[PDB]
Amino acid sequence: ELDQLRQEAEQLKNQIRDARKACADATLSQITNNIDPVGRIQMRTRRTLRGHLAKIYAMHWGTDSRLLVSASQDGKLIIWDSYTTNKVHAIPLRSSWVMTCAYAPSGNYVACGGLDNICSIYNLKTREGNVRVSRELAGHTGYLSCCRFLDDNQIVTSSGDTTCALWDIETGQQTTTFTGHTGDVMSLSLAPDTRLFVSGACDASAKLWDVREGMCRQTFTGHESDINAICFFPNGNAFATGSDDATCRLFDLRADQELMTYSHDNIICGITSVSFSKSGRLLLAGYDDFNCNVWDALKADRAGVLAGHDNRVSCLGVTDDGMAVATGSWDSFLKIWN
Amino acid sequence: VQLVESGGGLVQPGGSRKLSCSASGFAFSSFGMHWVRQAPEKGLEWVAYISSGSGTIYYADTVKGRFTISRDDPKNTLFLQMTSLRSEDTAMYYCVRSIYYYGSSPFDFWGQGTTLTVSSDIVMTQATSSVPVTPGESVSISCRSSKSLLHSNGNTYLYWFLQRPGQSPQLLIYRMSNLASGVPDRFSGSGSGTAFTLTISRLEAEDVGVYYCMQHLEYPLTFGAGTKLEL
Amino acid sequence: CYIQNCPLG
Amino acid sequence: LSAEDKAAVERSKMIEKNLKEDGISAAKDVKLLLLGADNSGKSTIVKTTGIVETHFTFKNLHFRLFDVGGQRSERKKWIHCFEDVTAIIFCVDLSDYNRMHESLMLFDSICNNKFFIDTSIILFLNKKDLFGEKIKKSPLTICFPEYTGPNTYEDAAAYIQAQFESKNRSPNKEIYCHMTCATDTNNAQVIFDAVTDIILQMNLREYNLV
Amino acid sequence: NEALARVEVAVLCLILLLALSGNACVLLALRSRLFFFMKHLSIADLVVAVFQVLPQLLWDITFRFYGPDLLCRLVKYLQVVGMFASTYLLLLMSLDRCLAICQPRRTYRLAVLATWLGCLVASAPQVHIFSLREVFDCWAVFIQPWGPKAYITWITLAVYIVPVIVLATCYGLISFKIWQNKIRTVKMTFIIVLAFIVCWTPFFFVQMWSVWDANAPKEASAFIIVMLLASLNSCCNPWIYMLFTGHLFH
Amino acid sequence: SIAQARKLVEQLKMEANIDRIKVSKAAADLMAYCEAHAKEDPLLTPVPASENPFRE
């Protein structure tokens, strides 16, 4: 009966909680001590990237570790060369409302997505002079929130329909769909080995998904509010995510219990984006107060602060080789640090 | 991508002539353009260059002052006004396109060119004129520069071109290491300082022709002598 | 003194 | 600093010129957020779909209405994309009263939102003739029985208005309510002079004239 | 005039330090279009302060210019450039504010460059009339008996009449427009006009009286003191602007 | 209506059957990965400007 099924679900929740508690023999805070703290680190704005004139929402370092991409209500994606601080490409977007952008690992394609409900794939490095639109991905009723590239033909997209999807770009149809989430899905992160990927949603939950067969292997909760952004640890066996509760959380895939909560009394509203460094010790998060913070992933204390922008720090990204961090903020100016 | 030329033929010395490159099939307005000529017996030599949007215009020392180049984006055309023709001006002219950004491939596509007959810095040294080969085994072609082509950056501005008999040249290697698009993997460029070498492993047919070694570190653009490769 | 002569500096 | 860089910088400067030209062209636009509820007369303003964007020219000005009803998602996570909108055309039908309480809730939510704490509201009271025809048959007392008072034509409209402004606690957010004349094509003038005011007081407070 | 010279150099140092402090206090606001024009006015007032009170100050301390003729001409030219630039930039800022209030980047640069060019053009006749004369100094040899009088009248009209009229009309249009829509605008226009008049009345009044030569008491000590006071405009105007917006300082 | 009951019950029984290692082991693994790649982190240790590409 239905009541029996609800009772079984509650018993399964109790079993999950008991297994997590018994498996949580200790916490990393008890063993992270007796080590050298990272200490005070100041990052100065090595380069300021100007040219945009609207709300910068998303950026993505390419595998080249030099080129980057950016989006706004400028009506156009722009691909920039970070070293010489000049913009290589200016793709005119079909819809001015874009909430996420991704740069392919091969550098051949770029992806944009937003409230238009369609994922646009633009093909760089074409025989034509200009950047043409390679493909349009439709099928998500909710607004797109985060897209990433697995290969040049496989793209992972999280939308506003509380569902994630994996698309074959050549065919243009959803290779597979993930509907475990209840609330709206905000941000997906691909694993370093491209074997798994996590997605944090509006129900204060982050769900792991296998790339091919695609059932929710793992589900982590503990946030008091909406999850805004997610990112794997470089090892691939952990991931940290930020929420509107002005805290970040670090989860491990092999142990369901969350490891650390990064929070300070000064911050009152939520994180907008997170990313990790090459060593994984330095977690960089774009906070509420037009400011970005740099947390020691093991000491769980604010290692450093970044100079503020004129508006909210919507996105930040650590480059592939870990040479620099680029923060894009609502003030239409990007900043590359070191 | 089509770069058909027009406006050539017999002409009296000291006359005037207009060369038209009617570009089609690509974004002409975003592409820098070059005119490169080759004597009936000698190798390639640069003539003129116009940047994107007519921002920058250059000429060769023999070309300077005597010739002019002007693009027309609305109709996708490239005009070369050709004044005071001399006997040495007789050559085949190729309209070339090239876009300059990070990771781009300049001189990727060459036009068919047209013949113009007149009635009567950096020097590229190719230490070869002809190399007898047989299909199936690797070959090496060497090139030398007046000074080091390794700029302040990590890239060395060396370009390799292949010209088959009766065919317009095509790009093989740009910046001395990167292979051009649409080119078989067999070709491989490698250089150090002033000594450069293009290696063709598993040489097959359709490789007979002239190989040209160009520099791009600083203007004017100067080609090599042109290594002939037969059999 | 600025566009004239100073009477007594 | 070789030749290829110089050409790359020239290309970058050309792209900058195109970007600034596009920005100048877009600066002439005025962004209006068209909100409301279901069957609230969204389409009467001019005369998988995430956003219905409409554009029209009036008195040497180009207005963009971002009529969004296809989201059907959590507004708290996508409404900040409309933070920089000149005005909120929050059209409300008056004949139907039902969704009047939920429309008032919506208005309370949107008016006190942190992003729109200072953005003004061009409140539209649609379906005046039908509301006047139906008020005599059914007294307003069903909706807001506390102080419905008389069932008079203009008294009911005045009470509904006063209820709408009462939901605003922002000191510097004037609500330019216009009692929409059913489906007659005159909304352009009130939109224009309301937005002209919005710009006027925006500049006045921008210059620290206080 | 040993005591008089000491008093004059002391008050010159005081006005120098006060003007520099007032112009530099704008840096506190650094860490809008109003701020865009405020910074430009501040740098213009810096251009004034460096090129206006320093030369006279050195001249009075040394009791003689003690410099080449070309240096003298350049110093006088920059003095006049600052005198015109401060007033014209204040006028341009007032016009921008009036246009914005009444009728709701690159063109601003074009306008400020045009104002600078006009200042250079208006300062050229200064050096044109001024010439070296024998101790060698720029004694401003005059080619006409009415030449100095005409030049003084033209400078007064360009620096006093037109600027006051334009500023008053712009601020009156602001007050009328806000009235058509308060005490704040009345206090604004009143304080701005009063400050401009109090800054530009004594120097040009005594200048006119001296150029008329109608038994002008130029020998009087008070006349000598007020002859040099013409830089307090840039000493007070930025200070008034920051003090009016006390929220900016806090 | 009713099918979500199954959806949830099989979802949770699949999540329950997974294997979990002690949180101490996971924390030790994270710390070891941090330590091993410590010298390869330009953000953690300021890279000298000689080969730093964003400065000189």
Short overview:
With about 350 residues, chain A is mainly beta. Chain A has 2 helices and 27 strands.
What does this structure look like?
Chain F: Keywords: Acetylation, Cell membrane, Host-virus interaction, Lipoprotein, Membrane, Methylation, Prenylation, Transducer. Chain F: GO terms for molecular function: G-protein beta-subunit binding. The complex is a heterohexamer of chains A (338), B (231), C (9), D (210), E (250) and F (56). Chain A is mainly beta and 338 residues long. Chain A has a single domain, classed as Methylamine Dehydrogenase, Chain H (7 Propeller), CATH 2.130.10.10. Chain A is 8% helix and 40% strand. Chain A is built from 2 helices and 27 strands. In chain A, the strands form 7 sheets. In chain A, strands 1-27-26-25 form a 4-stranded antiparallel β-sheet, with no helix packed on it. Chain A has a 4-stranded antiparallel β-sheet with strand order 5-6-7-8, with no helix packed on it. Chain B contains no helices and 21 strands. Chain B folds into 2 domains: 114 residues, Immunoglobulin-like; 106 residues, Sandwich (Immunoglobulin-like). By secondary structure, chain B is mostly beta strands. Chain D has 210 residues and is an alpha/beta fold. Chain D has one domain: 3-Layer(aba) Sandwich (Rossmann fold). In chain D, strand 2 and strand 3 form a beta hairpin. Classes of the chains: A mainly beta (338), B mainly beta (231), C little secondary structure (9), D alpha/beta (210), E mainly alpha (250), F mainly alpha (56).
Spatial strand order of the main sheet of chain E? 1-2
Series of H and E elements of chain E: HHHHHEEHHHHH
Structural class of chain D: alpha/beta
Largest interface: A-F, 60 and 39 residues
Radius of gyration of chain E, in Å, reads 19 Å
CATH hierarchy, class of chain D: Alpha Beta
Oligomer: heterohexamer
Secondary-structure arrangement, i.e. CATH architecture of chain D: 3-Layer(aba) Sandwich
**Could you give a short account of the major beta sheet of chain E?**
2 strands, antiparallel
Give the strand content of chain E.
under 5%
State the total count of DSSP E strands of chain E. Answer: 2
The CA-CA distance between the termini of chain D, in Å, is 52 Å
Give the total of beta strands of chain D.
5
Summarize this structure as a short list of keywords or feature phrases.
heterohexamer, D: 210 residues, alpha/beta, five-stranded mixed beta sheet, E: 250 residues, mainly alpha, two-stranded antiparallel sheet, 10 helices, signaling protein, OTR, G protein
How is the secondary structure organized here?
The complex is a heterohexamer of chains A (338), B (231), C (9), D (210), E (250) and F (56).
Chain C: no helix or strand
Chain E: H1 2-24, H2 27-30, H3 33-62, H4 69-102, H5 106-129, E1 132-133, E2 137-138, H6 147-180, H7 183-212, H8 221-228, H9 232-244, H10 246-249
Helix pairs in contact in E: 1-3, 1-9, 3-4, 4-5, 4-6, 6-7, 7-8, 7-9
Chain F: H1 3-16, H2 23-36
GO molecular function, one term (chain E): oxytocin receptor activity
Transmembrane segments (chain E): 5-29, 35-57, 74-95, 110-130, 154-176, 188-206, 222-244
Keywords (chain E): Cell membrane, Disulfide bond, G-protein coupled receptor, Glycoprotein, Membrane, Phosphoprotein, Receptor, Transducer, Transmembrane, Transmembrane helix
